[PDB]
């Protein structure tokens, strides 16, 4: 019969608005018929489950394009049935019958398909529904990600291996992208691509179904013979689940979970899964609360300075002359204030409305978008003589991008018109992957798509000359920009974002899928909104890797200055090469993402029980099932539901593998199935990732007697979740960058440990933290909670010192920009916590970062345990805004002001010259200013050559302090009383390199008048700022030791080399910090670098927490060196303590260790000191802290409302709340403005201050009764700087105690 590839599935068309299910199929075939035999629509109102018959398939009629369905019941107005239309459009795909309006007795939809495109120039052979429908009739239609030229390649961990599925129909072979997938077979769906072999996999047999919680399955099946060798006996067919990616669930490529015989599984987390929108509005520019789908037919009315701003469709009979969206008729109407009016071709005279501009319906329904109008006119039956008006999302349009509207197939005075334009086409969710191919090695992206989660998108730094009017960038890496806070009334379909006072900016399009260049990953924003000339905004974000820093945002590294094109760079994790990595203990470590996988919270002792119709599956993590019916060594037990006779689904098996966000536990060999092969039963789970599922159910599906596949969906099995340790100041616009605070797995492991001492061995409670990550695997306190608290169980016995578990909070906000220049870190929703019991909640971690511009170490200190409110305080060097501070003079040292480090490129100062080879053009090369090979002009022998020789050149560099170091030198020819030629060197870390050679970037030659600049960046070791260092270090047994004196050094540290023969080398060593810049070493991170005979042996890298051993004891070994017989090197400082500051003496050498002994005092551990009125004496250093110079002033901090005046070491002279008459020595006073101002007394004079690891606590006890309880203390912490004694106040701890740091100049230790 008519459109041959529609009768063998039924067909369902929701209507949103009053909840009625249409049921249609066209030759009448009908399981659901409770309505008449043969059946064609079958209306299913939802509520009242009424099934009427609308349709009888035996009096289908036809038209052009248009499938009618006339009944026999007969309509409530007379001579009327309850009619149907089925109007017929080309997509690309078989598409779904959507619903476009009815009245009483006749139903319209529109059904856009391949069976209408009469044209079948590369046709689809099978090709099945690929629409869901859940319970309450929303939908899962997943058209528009069927791939009609070319495969999705399906990321296994296979090089040698490439499944190739598209989804819903036969992969075109034929005119294909990729080498392998012309290979395949016709008629294929999967098209395992096997050695330069493509086997027939999948066949497209039934259409996609929901069955599962919310996720859709679809199975691909090949029966009959001439299976391949590969399947030991079992029909090849792959079953691809379909998932929508909320908070829970990350990826967007296609995933294989198991490739253990020829059974596929693929869970594929694509946006097209999610309930497709239908929206509907009034007369134009349909928009909801979902602010994805962007339509105005504004520009459709808006027409171009071209004649004829009505349009005209050629038709059957007599023409269509039409007007839409409140735009100027055709004067052939004359007067009608007709939208669309129909022409009669025999006269001009008679004139029918077919459609007025007060009704109508711009309805969305599921990317199909419709334009109905209602009341034009009577026409021969009775029917209001209604239009409507389907768009087709048509780019390369006519009219300059507006198109014409073709006429199709009229029924029953209601005039169908398709239409291909422009403004009328969307991408509603994305339909393009977020991975890539370097050939074998896969990549994915799908990490830092914020992916329609509607929590906030990232944010921008700029790392580039941002000028008075600097703004904030808001890109989003695989998606339409996340309307949420500072990013709302931003143009929607733009994946970067510029918003400023002045408006928003569309800054690029997410038009074309990332490309692997350069050996990083590029990701090309074209379409942006309008720079000068007509020219749209490129935007190339390049995503580098890092291993395990996902908490990083895009520096902007350049732009043009003409707003026509900006380059952002981004040094994040999900941009590193995917790897199969395997776990032995029940922990899989993450490579590519710094986590470390252990699922031994997933070991229940007792059994889980999966329940199918036949089997009872008793499957158990990383150990034995405990059920008696099975093999004692079970990992998994098939029991039956009849029989009840046991069947061992594999041994227990603690191996783990992780790939690309799921992790395959295989259980397999145990008990065989009775086959002549002996075939052992084996079965695999896979652990994927779901946030917020706890340990989770496994879940059964296959369809055959076969080796069992179960899927888990974890919350452990899930990474960091990428939450940006970045914040933007609101009313300035100053950056903060807390991303190199993140302490993560692989590298030398570590916290950021903070102890509190307080009382002697009960309540030292030692806090673990972590900034915007979960933790590190830290025995016994929680994973994915950002601080565990980790009390002692030490009875004083050397052996008995161990630590045991609390869980403060999970890291989700990111940090917070609080008053007076410091930002809050808020972890919310902990473990269980005891209070004041009037109301027990979750645990919180408020830590206060205020920056110290000191030296690169760094050390928590903690500062309050209230009300289940952990506090603490972070005097960091990263916690200050972003600077770039330029500098003209000498140009290969800079200094950065807020890390103290000094990249010097001294070692890039190459006397014979780099040789950059250009683009048909040799530039002799050198950065200190020194290659006089070329002109040695006046001052100027700096390095300036476009070979035959261009210039010599004035020379400038910059920092950021976010991974951008650039050389701007400038020519002497300032052209013509304008800019210079000013070309560029640009700085990036490779680790693993030499000083190295330029690679010649891109050079951007633009005569304005005389501009020009050829940027060539390279990747050296002295580019990037090394991560902040915990030179603080525990033992076991509770002694915190701090080494953070030996990094401060005026000279790097030598030693007395006089042992070994008294030779004539020198021995620079450092601690905690790397060498600065001695040259002819490996100077990336050195620990110590041996000089002589210009054999300059680089014999160790800095461990940052030393080893421990006995009381007042250190050892510190530098563990990466060079070139001696398969050791690297060993370098051992004993930092024992004795109470001399001696050098650290050379002890002996032997098997390539070089061992010192260092008696310095700093291998004491710290001792808590409580001093005296001002003073504390002898502090482990043998110094005096005497704050009563900062006595001799009443000292005001503010909050917003509150004011908190006080005064060091005694007694507070006015106040408005010196409101006693008492022997009250009062030396504080918190405050209120006017109202509510019974203001309260101080924390009263104690002149004690206590002396805590390097910061100074002052307490000042004894205040008024505060809420229930404690009494309204204030606390001072004195921290190390130049006396910026404008006091932080550390804002909302508890409300009955106030926390200040001073980041004063006599706190600091001479
Ligand atoms: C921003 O990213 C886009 C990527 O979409 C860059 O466009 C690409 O620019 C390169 C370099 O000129 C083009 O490569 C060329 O390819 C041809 C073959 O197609 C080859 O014969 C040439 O030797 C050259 O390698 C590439 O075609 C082009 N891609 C486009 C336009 O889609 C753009 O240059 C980047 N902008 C930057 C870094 O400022
Ligand atoms: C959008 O529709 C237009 C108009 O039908 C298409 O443009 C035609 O494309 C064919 C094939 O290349 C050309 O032979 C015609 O000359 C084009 N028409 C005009 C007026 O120039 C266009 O191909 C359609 N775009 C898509 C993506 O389907
Ligand atoms: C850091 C700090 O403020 N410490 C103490 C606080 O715990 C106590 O309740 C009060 C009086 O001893 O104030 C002080
Ligand atoms: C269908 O409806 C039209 C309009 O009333 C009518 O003229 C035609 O005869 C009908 N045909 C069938 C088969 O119901
Ligand atoms: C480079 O330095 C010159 C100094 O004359 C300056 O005019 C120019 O703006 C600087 N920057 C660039 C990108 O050329």
Same mark, same amino acid.
């Given at each position: 019969?008519?459109?041959?590839?529609?009768?063998?599935?039924?067909?369902?068309?929701?209507?949103?608005?009053?909840?009625?299910?249409?049921?249609?199929?066209?030759?009448?075939?009908?399981?659901?018929?409770?309505?008449?035999?043969?059946?064609?629509?079958?209306?299913?109102?939802?509520?009242?489950?009424?099934?009427?018959?609308?349709?009888?398939?035996?009096?289908?009629?036809?038209?052009?394009?248009?499938?009618?369905?006339?009944?026999?019941?007969?309509?409530?107005?007379?001579?009327?049935?309850?009619?149907?239309?089925?109007?017929?459009?080309?997509?690309? +795909?078989?598409? +779904?019958?959507?619903?476009? #309006?009815?009245?009483?007795?006749?139903?319209?939809?529109?059904?856009?398909? +391949?069976?209408?495109?009469?044209?079948?120039?590369?046709?689809?052979?099978?090709?099945?529904?690929?629409?869901?429908?859940?319970?309450?009739?929303?939908?899962?239609?997943?058209?528009?990600?069927?791939?009609?030229?070319?495969?999705?390649?399906?990321? *296994?961990?296979?090089?040698?291996?490439?499944?190739?599925?598209?989804?819903?129909?036969?992969?075109?072979?034929?005119?294909?992208?990729?080498?392998?997938?012309?290979?395949?077979?016709?008629?294929?769906?999967?098209?395992?691509?096997?050695?330069?072999?493509?086997?027939? %996999?999948?066949?497209?047999?039934?259409?996609?179904?929901?069955?599962?919680?919310?996720?859709?399955?679809?199975?691909?099946?090949?029966?009959?013979?001439?299976?391949?060798?590969?399947?030991?006996?079992?029909?090849?067919?792959? /079953?691809?689940?379909?998932?929508?990616?909320?908070?829970?669930?990350?990826? /967007?490529?296609?995933?294989? +979970?198991?490739?253990?015989? =020829?059974?596929?599984?693929?869970?594929?987390?694509?946006?097209?899964?999610?309930?497709?929108?239908?929206?509907?509005?009034?007369?134009?520019?349909?928009?909801?609360?979902?602010?994805?789908?962007?339509?105005?037919?504004?520009?459709?009315?808006?027409?171009?300075?071209?004649?004829?701003?009505?349009?005209?469709?050629?038709?059957?009979?007599?023409?269509?002359?039409?007007?839409?969206?409140?735009?100027?008729?055709?004067?052939?109407?004359?007067?009608?204030?007709?939208?669309?009016?129909?022409?009669?071709?025999?006269?001009?005279?008679?004139?029918?409305?077919?459609?007025?501009?007060?009704?109508?319906?711009?309805?969305?329904?599921?990317?199909?978008?419709?334009?109905?109008?209602?009341?034009?006119?009577?026409?021969?039956?009775?029917?209001?003589?209604?239009?409507?008006?389907?768009?087709?999302?048509?780019?390369?349009?006519?009219?300059?991008?507006?198109?014409?509207?073709?006429?199709?197939?009229?029924?029953?005075?209601?005039?169908?018109?398709?239409?291909?334009?422009?403004?009328?086409?969307?991408?509603?969710?994305?339909?393009?992957?977020?991975?890539?191919?370097?050939?074998?090695?896969?990549?994915?992206?799908?990490?830092?798509?914020?992916?329609?989660?509607?929590?906030?998108?990232?944010?921008?730094?700029?790392?580039?000359?941002?000028?008075?009017?600097?703004?904030?960038?808001?890109?989003?890496?695989?998606?339409?920009?996340?309307?949420?806070? @500072?990013?709302?009334?931003?143009?929607?379909?733009?994946?970067?974002?510029?918003?400023?006072?002045?408006?928003?900016?569309?800054?690029?399009?997410?038009?074309?899928?990332?490309?692997?260049?350069?050996?990083?990953?590029?990701?090309?924003?074209?379409?942006?909104?309008?720079?000068?000339?007509?020219?749209?905004?490129?935007?190339?974000?390049?995503?580098?890797?890092?291993?395990?820093?996902?908490?990083?945002?895009?520096?902007?590294?350049?732009?043009?200055?003409?707003?026509?094109?900006?380059?952002?760079?981004?040094?994040?994790?999900?941009?590193?090469?995917?790897?199969?990595?395997?776990?032995?203990?029940?922990? %899989?470590?993450?490579?590519?993402?710094?986590?470390?996988?252990?699922?031994?919270?997933?070991?229940?002792?007792?059994?889980?029980?999966?329940?199918? *119709?036949?089997?009872?599956?008793?499957?158990?993590? =990383?150990?034995?099932?405990?059920?008696?019916?099975?093999?004692?060594?079970?990992?998994?037990?098939?029991?039956?539901?009849?029989?009840?006779?046991?069947?061992?689904?594999?041994?227990?098996?603690?191996?783990?593998?992780?790939?690309?966000?799921?992790?395959?536990?295989?259980?397999?060999?145990?008990?065989?199935?009775?086959?002549?092969?002996?075939?052992?039963?084996?079965?695999?789970?896979?652990?994927?990732?779901?946030?917020?599922?706890?340990?989770?159910?496994?879940?059964?599906?296959?369809?055959?007697?076969? /080796?069992?596949?179960?899927?888990?969906? #974890?919350?452990?099995? =899930?990474?960091?979740?990428?939450?940006?340790?970045?914040?933007?100041?609101?009313?300035?616009?100053?950056?903060?960058?807390?991303?190199?605070?993140?302490?993560?797995?692989?590298?030398?492991?570590?916290?950021?440990?903070?102890?509190?001492?307080?009382?002697?061995?009960?309540?030292?409670?030692?806090?673990?933290?972590?900034?915007?990550?979960?933790?590190?695997?830290?025995?016994?306190?929680?994973?994915?909670?950002?601080?565990?608290?980790?009390?002692?169980?030490?009875?004083?016995?050397?052996?008995?010192?161990?630590?045991?578990?609390?869980?403060?909070?999970?890291?989700?906000?990111?940090?917070?920009?609080?008053?007076?220049?410091?930002?809050?870190?808020?972890?919310?929703?902990?473990?269980?916590?005891?209070?004041?019991?009037?109301?027990?909640?979750?645990?919180?971690?408020?830590?206060?970062?205020?920056?110290?511009?000191?030296?690169?170490?760094?050390?928590?200190?903690?500062?309050?345990?209230?009300?289940?409110?952990?506090?603490?305080?972070?005097?960091?060097?990263?916690?200050?805004?972003?600077?770039?501070?330029?500098?003209?003079?000498?140009?290969?040292?800079?200094?950065?002001?807020?890390?103290?480090?000094?990249?010097?490129?001294?070692?890039?100062?190459?006397?014979?010259?780099?040789?950059?080879?250009?683009?048909?053009?040799?530039?002799?090369?050198?950065?200190?200013?020194?290659?006089?090979?070329?002109?040695?002009?006046?001052?100027?022998?700096?390095?300036?050559?476009?070979?035959?020789?261009?210039?010599?050149?004035?020379?400038?560099? @910059?920092?950021?302090?976010?991974?951008?170091?650039?050389?701007?030198?400038?020519?002497?020819?300032?052209?013509?009383?304008?800019?210079?030629?000013?070309?560029?060197?640009?700085?990036?870390?490779?680790?693993?390199?030499?000083?190295?050679?330029?690679?010649?970037?891109?050079?951007?030659?633009?005569?304005?008048?005389?501009?020009?600049?050829?940027?060539?960046?390279?990747?050296?070791?002295?580019?990037?700022?090394?991560?902040?260092?915990?030179?603080?270090?525990?033992?076991?047994?509770?002694?915190?030791?701090?080494?953070?004196?030996?990094?401060?050094?005026?000279?790097?540290?030598?030693?007395?080399?006089?042992?070994?023969?008294?030779?004539?080398?020198?021995?620079?060593?450092?601690?905690?910090?790397?060498?600065?810049?001695?040259?002819?070493?490996?100077?990336?991170?050195?620990?110590?670098?041996?000089?002589?005979?210009?054999?300059?042996?680089?014999?160790?890298?800095?461990?940052?927490?030393?080893?421990?051993?006995?009381?007042?004891?250190?050892?510190?070994?530098?563990?990466?060196?060079?070139?001696?017989?398969?050791?690297?090197?060993?370098?051992?400082?004993?930092?024992?303590?004795?109470?001399?500051?001696?050098?650290?003496?050379? @002890?002996?050498?032997?098997? =390539?260790?070089?061992?010192?002994?260092?008696?310095?005092?700093?291998?004491?551990?710290?001792?808590?000191?409580?001093? *005296?009125?001002?003073?504390?004496?002898?502090?482990?250093?043998?110094?005096?802290?005497?704050?009563?110079?900062?006595?001799?002033?009443?000292?005001?901090?503010?909050?917003?409302?509150?004011?908190?005046?006080?005064?060091?070491?005694?007694?507070?002279?006015?106040?408005?709340?010196?409101?006693?008459?008492?022997?009250?020595?009062?030396?504080?006073?918190?405050?209120?403005?006017?109202?509510?101002?019974?203001?309260?007394?101080?924390?009263?004079?104690?002149?004690?201050?206590?002396?805590?690891?390097?910061?100074?606590?002052?307490?000042?006890?004894?205040?008024?009764?505060?809420?229930?309880?404690?009494?309204?203390? /204030?606390?001072?912490?004195?921290?190390?700087?130049?006396?910026?004694?404008?006091?932080?106040?550390?804002?909302?701890?508890?409300?009955?105690?106030?926390?200040?740091?001073?980041?004063?100049?006599?706190?600091?230790?001479?």
């Amino acid at each position: 019969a008519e459109f041959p590839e529609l009768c063998s599935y039924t067909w369902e068309a929701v209507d949103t608005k009053n909840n009625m299910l249409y049921k249609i199929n066209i030759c009448g075939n009908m399981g659901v018929a409770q309505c008449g035999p043969s059946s064609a629509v079958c209306m299913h109102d939802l509520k009242t489950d009424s099934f009427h018959s609308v349709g009888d398939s035996l009096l289908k009629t036809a038209s052009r394009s248009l499938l009618e369905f006339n009944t026999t019941v007969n309509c409530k107005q007379q001579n009327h049935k309850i009619q149907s239309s089925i109007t017929f459009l080309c997509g690309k +795909t078989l598409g +779904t019958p959507e619903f476009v #309006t009815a009245t009483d007795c006749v139903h319209y939809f529109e059904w856009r398909t +391949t069976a209408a495109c009469k044209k079948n120039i590369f046709k689809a052979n099978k090709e099945v529904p690929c629409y869901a429908f859940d319970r309450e009739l929303k939908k899962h239609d997943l058209n528009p990600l069927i791939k009609t030229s070319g495969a999705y390649l399906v990321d *296994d961990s296979d090089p040698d291996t490439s499944l190739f599925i598209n989804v819903c129909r036969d992969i075109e072979v034929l005119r294909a992208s990729s080498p392998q997938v012309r290979v395949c077979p016709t008629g294929a769906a999967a098209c395992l691509v096997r050695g330069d072999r493509a086997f027939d %996999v999948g066949r497209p047999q039934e259409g996609l179904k929901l069955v599962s919680n919310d996720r859709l399955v679809l199975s691909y099946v090949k029966e009959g013979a001439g299976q391949p060798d590969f399947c030991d006996g079992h029909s090849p067919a792959v /079953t691809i689940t379909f998932v929508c990616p909320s908070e829970r669930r990350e990826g /967007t490529i296609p995933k294989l +979970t198991a490739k253990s015989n =020829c059974r596929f599984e693929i869970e594929w987390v694509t946006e097209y899964a999610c309930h497709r929108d239908y929206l509907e509005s009034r007369s134009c520019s349909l928009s909801s609360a979902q602010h994805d789908v962007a339509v105005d037919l504004q520009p459709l009315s808006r027409v171009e300075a071209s004649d004829s701003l009505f349009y005209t469709s050629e038709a059957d009979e007599y023409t269509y002359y039409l007007s839409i969206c409140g735009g100027s008729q055709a004067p052939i109407c004359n007067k009608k204030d007709a939208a669309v009016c129909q022409v009669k071709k025999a006269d001009s005279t008679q004139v029918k409305v077919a459609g007025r501009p007060q009704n109508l319906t711009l309805r969305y329904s599921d990317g199909d978008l419709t334009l109905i109008y209602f009341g034009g006119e009577e026409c021969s039956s009775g029917f209001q003589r209604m239009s409507v008006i389907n768009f087709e999302c048509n780019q390369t349009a006519g009219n300059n991008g507006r198109g014409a509207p073709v006429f199709t197939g009229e029924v029953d005075c209601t005039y169908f018109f398709t239409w291909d334009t422009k403004y009328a086409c969307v991408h509603e969710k994305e339909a393009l992957l977020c991975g890539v191919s370097d050939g074998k090695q896969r990549f994915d992206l799908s990490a830092l798509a914020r992916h329609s989660e509607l929590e906030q998108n990232w944010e921008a730094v700029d790392g580039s000359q941002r000028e008075a009017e600097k703004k904030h960038f808001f890109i989003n890496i695989c998606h339409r920009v996340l309307q949420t806070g @500072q990013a709302r009334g931003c143009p929607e379909d733009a994946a970067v974002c510029a918003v400023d006072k002045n408006g928003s900016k569309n800054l690029g399009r997410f038009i074309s899928s990332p490309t692997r260049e350069k050996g990083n990953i590029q990701l090309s924003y074209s379409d942006g909104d309008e720079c000068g000339g007509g020219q749209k905004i490129i935007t190339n974000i390049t995503l580098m890797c890092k291993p395990g820093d996902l908490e990083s945002a895009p520096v902007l590294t350049t732009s043009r200055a003409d707003g026509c094109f900006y380059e952002f760079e981004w040094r994040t994790a999900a941009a590193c090469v995917l790897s199969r990595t395997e776990g032995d203990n029940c922990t %899989v470590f993450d490579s590519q993402a710094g986590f470390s996988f252990d699922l031994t919270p997933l070991t229940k002792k007792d059994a889980y029980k999966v329940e199918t *119709d036949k089997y009872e599956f008793h499957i158990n993590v =990383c150990g034995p099932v405990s059920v008696g019916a099975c093999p004692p060594d079970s990992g998994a037990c098939q029991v039956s539901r009849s029989d009840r006779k046991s069947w061992n689904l594999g041994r227990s098996n603690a191996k783990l593998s992780y790939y690309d966000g799921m992790i395959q536990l295989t259980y397999r060999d145990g008990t065989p199935y009775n086959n002549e092969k002996r075939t052992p039963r084996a079965t695999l789970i896979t652990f994927l990732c779901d946030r917020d599922a706890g340990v989770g159910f496994p879940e059964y599906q296959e369809e055959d007697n076969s /080796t069992y596949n179960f899927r888990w969906y #974890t919350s452990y099995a =899930c990474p960091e979740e990428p939450l940006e340790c970045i914040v933007t100041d609101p009313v300035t616009l100053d950056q903060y960058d807390l991303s190199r605070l993140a302490k993560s797995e692989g590298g030398p492991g570590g916290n950021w440990y903070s102890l509190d001492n307080g009382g002697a061995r009960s309540t030292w409670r030692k806090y673990y933290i972590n900034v915007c990550r979960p933790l590190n695997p830290v025995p016994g306190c929680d994973r994915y909670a950002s601080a565990c608290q980790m009390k002692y169980q030490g009875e004083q016995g050397s052996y008995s010192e161990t630590v045991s578990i609390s869980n403060l909070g999970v890291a989700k906000t990111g940090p917070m920009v609080e008053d007076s220049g410091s930002l809050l870190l808020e972890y919310v929703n902990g473990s269980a916590c005891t209070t004041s019991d009037q109301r027990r909640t979750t645990y919180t971690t408020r830590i206060h970062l205020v920056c110290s511009t000191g030296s690169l170490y760094t050390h928590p200190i903690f500062s309050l345990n209230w009300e289940c409110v952990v506090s603490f305080l972070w005097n960091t060097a990263a916690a200050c805004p972003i600077r770039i501070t330029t500098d003209i003079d000498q140009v290969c040292s800079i200094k950065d002001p807020n890390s103290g480090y000094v990249f010097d490129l001294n070692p890039l100062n190459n006397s014979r010259g780099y040789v950059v080879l250009g683009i048909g053009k040799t530039f002799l090369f050198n950065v200190c200013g020194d290659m006089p090979a070329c002109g040695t002009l006046d001052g100027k022998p700096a390095s300036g050559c476009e070979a035959e020789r261009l210039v010599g050149l004035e020379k400038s560099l @910059q920092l950021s302090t976010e991974g951008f170091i650039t050389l701007n030198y400038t020519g002497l020819p300032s052209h013509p009383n304008g800019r210079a030629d000013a070309f560029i060197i640009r700085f990036v870390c490779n680790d693993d390199v030499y000083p190295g050679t330029p690679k010649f970037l891109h050079q951007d030659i633009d005569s304005s008048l005389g501009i020009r600049d050829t940027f060539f960046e390279f990747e050296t070791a002295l580019a990037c700022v090394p991560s902040p260092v915990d030179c603080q270090v525990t033992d076991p047994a509770g002694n915190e030791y701090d080494l953070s004196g030996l990094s401060k050094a005026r000279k790097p540290w030598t030693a007395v080399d006089t042992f070994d023969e008294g030779k004539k080398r020198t021995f620079y060593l450092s601690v905690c910090t790397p060498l600065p810049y001695i040259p002819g070493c490996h100077g990336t991170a050195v620990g110590c670098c041996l000089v002589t005979e210009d054999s300059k042996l680089n014999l160790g890298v800095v461990q940052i927490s030393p080893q421990v051993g006995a009381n007042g004891s250190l050892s510190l070994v530098y563990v990466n060196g060079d070139k001696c017989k398969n050791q690297r090197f060993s370098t051992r400082i004993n930092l024992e303590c004795a109470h001399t500051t001696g050098s650290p003496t050379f @002890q002996l050498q032997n098997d =390539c260790e070089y061992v010192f002994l260092w008696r310095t005092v700093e291998a004491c551990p710290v001792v808590r000191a409580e001093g *005296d009125y001002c003073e504390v004496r002898d502090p482990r250093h043998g110094n005096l802290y005497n704050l009563i110079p900062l006595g001799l002033n009443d000292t005001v901090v503010r909050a917003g409302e509150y004011t908190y005046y006080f005064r060091v070491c005694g007694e507070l002279t006015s106040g408005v709340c010196p409101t006693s008459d008492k022997s009250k020595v009062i030396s504080s006073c918190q405050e209120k403005r006017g109202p509510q101002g019974f203001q309260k007394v101080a924390g009263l004079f104690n002149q004690k201050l206590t002396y805590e690891n390097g910061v100074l606590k002052m307490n000042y006890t004894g205040g008024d009764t505060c809420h229930k309880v404690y009494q309204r203390s /204030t606390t001072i912490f004195f921290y190390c700087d130049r006396s910026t004694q404008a006091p932080v106040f550390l804002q909302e701890t508890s409300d009955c105690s106030y926390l200040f740091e001073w980041r004063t100049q006599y706190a600091c230790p001479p």
